Amino acid sequence: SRLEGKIAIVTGASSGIGRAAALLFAREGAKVVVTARNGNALAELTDEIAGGGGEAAALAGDVGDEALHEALVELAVRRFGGLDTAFNNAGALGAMGEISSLSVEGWRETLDTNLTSAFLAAKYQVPAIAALGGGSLTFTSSFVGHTAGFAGVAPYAASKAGLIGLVQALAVELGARGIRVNALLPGGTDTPANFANETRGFVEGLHALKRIARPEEIAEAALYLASDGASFVTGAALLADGGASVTK
Amino acid sequence: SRLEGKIAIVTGASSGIGRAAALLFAREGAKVVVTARNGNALAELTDEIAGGGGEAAALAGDVGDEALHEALVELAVRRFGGLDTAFNNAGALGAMGEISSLSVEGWRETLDTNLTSAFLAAKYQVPAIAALGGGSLTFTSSFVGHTAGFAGVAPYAASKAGLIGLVQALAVELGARGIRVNALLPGGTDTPANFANETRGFVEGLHALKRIARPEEIAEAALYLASDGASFVTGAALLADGGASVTK
Amino acid sequence: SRLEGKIAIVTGASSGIGRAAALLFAREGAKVVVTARNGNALAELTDEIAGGGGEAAALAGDVGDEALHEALVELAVRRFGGLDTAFNNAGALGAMGEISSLSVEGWRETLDTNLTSAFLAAKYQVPAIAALGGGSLTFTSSFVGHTAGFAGVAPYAASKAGLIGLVQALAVELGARGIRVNALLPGGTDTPANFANLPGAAPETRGFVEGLHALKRIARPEEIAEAALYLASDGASFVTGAALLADGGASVTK
Amino acid sequence: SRLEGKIAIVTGASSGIGRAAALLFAREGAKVVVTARNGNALAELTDEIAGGGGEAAALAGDVGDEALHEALVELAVRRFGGLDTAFNNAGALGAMGEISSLSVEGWRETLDTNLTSAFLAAKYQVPAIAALGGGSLTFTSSFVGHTAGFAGVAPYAASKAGLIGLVQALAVELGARGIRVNALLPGGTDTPANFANLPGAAPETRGFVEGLHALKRIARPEEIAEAALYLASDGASFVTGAALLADGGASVTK
Ligand SMILES: NC(=O)c1ccc[n+]([C@@H]2O[C@H](COP(=O)([O-])OP(=O)(O)OC[C@H]3O[C@@H](n4cnc5c(N)ncnc54)[C@H](OP(=O)(O)O)[C@@H]3O)[C@@H](O)[C@H]2O)c1
Ligand SMILES: NC(=O)c1ccc[n+]([C@@H]2O[C@H](COP(=O)([O-])OP(=O)(O)OC[C@H]3O[C@@H](n4cnc5c(N)ncnc54)[C@H](OP(=O)(O)O)[C@@H]3O)[C@@H](O)[C@H]2O)c1
Ligand SMILES: NC(=O)c1ccc[n+]([C@@H]2O[C@H](COP(=O)([O-])OP(=O)(O)OC[C@H]3O[C@@H](n4cnc5c(N)ncnc54)[C@H](OP(=O)(O)O)[C@@H]3O)[C@@H](O)[C@H]2O)c1
């Protein structure tokens, strides 16, 4: 029960990290509000949470929409009575390709899904969290655009790096109200988002640990940042990347 | 003549840093293509360059528009024969305020002017630079969102941090073609963009040097990143911030 | 029982962050081996631990001495059967003052205490941890010398930053054998080492130090200990090569 | 004449980056005072400098010795009238190998050469620079221990990272008096210290090292010297407390 008593939003819940996090947080005593575009995946997820003994509510929607973010928090407060924490984990690789071939349409979709989503998440989540008197927001960034670049990925890397800026700003803006704000930066994790999913070997070799994370290991880092154990952690870009940052 | 022979685009040219950079680059032997929204300022700028003995061309436009970026490079190649370097310096504080009061409209304008502009700049500039066989793009970021947060500034901080991600991605993507890509991160500089413009004292105290930069000192750092002296500098987020990053 | 089954060394265990961390680890299930210079302080801590029904062993010595680190690891292995984790936390501000006034003696002593100690810890800790099939080493660095400079603390800042280079090298060297290596970087923490608490201090220092933090308060040592427990925990299985700021937002606050 | 009027100390001046930087600074107008252990190498460099009609003075000594740094500054002030800038560049990979195999002697000697030297440089350089009304100190660090770890180089990585902490502390301490303090962090550079060039090296190392860089090539020493000239130049008047990567994109390349 490392999150006992907490009420959490998890976005990007329908697979890999988000899914493992919603499941873990619920196991550990948090009441979870989940979201993703794929209602069918959400239903398999909320099913699995129920009958593990946990409570979860879902809302299907596009994480780029302002009205989803508002509704999502309204839900948390309706169903469970308030909101303690949010794991803003939605994002996608988006459109990839050599810089000069990319469309501005593709650039804006990627930034909308990965970075505008986080602004809107903050915009609605912060009042409800400030109401319980604290205390946390975590955003899934990436080592990509923070400690490494790759060919073909400029929109994703810019969107992920932007989350670090948003985190530093919010952490200072909300610190006095007792809301911590951190970025979580996975390395290669075993999900459809991973280039691997001879690629597998190449990807594992990127990490000092010489393997790819299970999604549950990234959820555990998200669980830490949402826990009371992280009461003095804010404005941080926590690398849970198996050493990928420091491996060449 | 530290830039002799070079052909440069400078965006955000109509005041402070951009203006000092266009003037400096021209003094130092580069042919300069300048842009900003304010045609009247551009005319005072191109005037001052002429009769210093330098050559400059201008195009007035919104740096968020794809067609400006295309036209701008076409100009450089039309008027001067190609393109060596670009100082992507356009940006603005944009809409400020406590996170939950901000509009998504205001968020998207700020990101458009500060970060989408840079993608579009890259999209058109890289082919013309790859044509001369190299070699540079510099983008004006900020210490804000990289080493510091402030209340009320989340969209600016996210947009500025995003430029660092875009830089790391492009630097790896284009390194093999001989195009260096760097971010330049000013601290407080004496321009209308500076909070100062009892604020003055507070701002100066933010820096280890206990003063605000002249715009010409930031141009000098931009001149270095565009120079042959920076032939082994790429993927770098160069702090020209008077120590603001490390001062508490 | 967050660290049930773990065998941990904790250095700088006689006060502050180190004491809270050795107590916390033991209360959470770990068998703990504790060190500091003050043998009477260690003895009261192990008494408290074994007493609340935990398990601890103590060895007093200078953390800059190679024989002490060797015998620490011998004590964990002997008494408890192995070594899974180390929290290499001992450190001291060392001699402070304007750069041209400092002695090289004072500089070397600061480095030896803060940084040479970490090399010697690693030198003896690594074979024992590797024997178990893997585990972790955590070193207490600081936000000072990583995201901030202050006047008068050049030896301290150098020594703390040096731990981050040691961390990155060892995370790569040891990663394929399952040993994670991280730095933990506290903000202002309410201990004898905090600027505000020195002998010494102007009244206004406490407010100055608190105001350095986005949270606008100085950490209880327990808060830093929970971060160190995170990093030693199985919950940190994919965290290595990191410099984890547990600094209340100090790094980003101006 | 990019440094016309400047009086500069350059350490590690007998080869590599340091030699190219002392030559370059002098060819660009600075009066240069050069040091390394190899007195015959220094003498050929000053001969070349004074000879191309520049001005240089030499003093051979161990960069880990306090008396050497004191006398270096005495030599600049005496011969040239002041001190504006230092390029504290001397460094050595030092003893390398798996962490449990390294001696504490080898560790201390690496640190003394790479990091204690920087403290002693600063201790004597700062009063002389301050006398002039300000200037700069630049220290050659490395991307290793800042954005990368490698196996077998723990002392080197620690010592190089430590320079960044020293930089941040001194930039704050000295900034109000107009002394800028920066670290310069090269990538692979074609000198005797480069992995590929060691005695030693497997054929395939050169390609491995080149491929570490976004530019896909190892730097000529002159390229790193131009970066150091930037940081000593008036063009870097608002650059302090920075760790400038002149590393060909190594930091961001995987
Ligand atoms: N996997 C890695 O190796 C790795 C490395 C670094 C960072 N990350 C980051 O890790 C986070 C979690 O992703 P994962 O690795 O677990 O990949 P994943 O398996 O694809 O999970 C991504 C989640 O984001 C959601 N998403 C995408 N577009 C959305 C939209 N427009 N509206 C609402 N949700 C949307 C998806 O939901 P629907 O498709 O059902 O909407 C899905 O639930 C992401 O932010 C990713 O960028 C992953
Ligand atoms: N000043 C500081 O203290 C400080 C600190 C950190 C970072 N920066 C960054 O430094 C860079 C240069 O700004 P500055 O400090 O020199 O401030 P400034 O005096 O306001 O110059 C900003 C330039 O950006 C242009 N701009 C804004 N919106 C535009 C648009 N929509 N379309 C085309 N151009 C637009 C402006 O041109 P028009 O208005 O004529 O279009 C102006 O030429 C900016 O990216 C800024 O964010 C400044
Ligand atoms: N307090 C803060 O605000 C703050 C901020 C950032 C980083 N840190 C770091 O946090 C870590 C814990 O310090 P703290 O705040 O808990 O202060 P503390 O209360 O003074 O604890 C320091 C501990 O290190 C031990 N130590 C010092 N020199 C030693 C030596 N030569 N040989 C063996 N042990 C030695 C001391 O024990 P004996 O004297 O009994 O040997 C004491 O147990 C240190 O590395 C410190 O630098 C503290």
Ligand SMILES: NC(=O)c1ccc[n+]([C@@H]2O[C@H](COP(=O)([O-])OP(=O)(O)OC[C@H]3O[C@@H](n4cnc5c(N)ncnc54)[C@H](OP(=O)(O)O)[C@@H]3O)[C@@H](O)[C@H]2O)c1
């Ligand atoms: N080469 C690279 O790939 C690379 C990468 C990152 C950082 N660096 C750093 O770059 C800086 C310059 O090295 P380099 O590449 O130019 O290699 P280098 O050719 O070996 O030059 C090293 C210089 O430092 C001097 N030195 C070493 N130990 C000394 C001591 N104890 N006392 C006085 N001088 C000493 C050497 O001179 P004597 O032997 O004549 O005294 C030599 O002049 C060093 O700090 C190095 O660590 C190099």
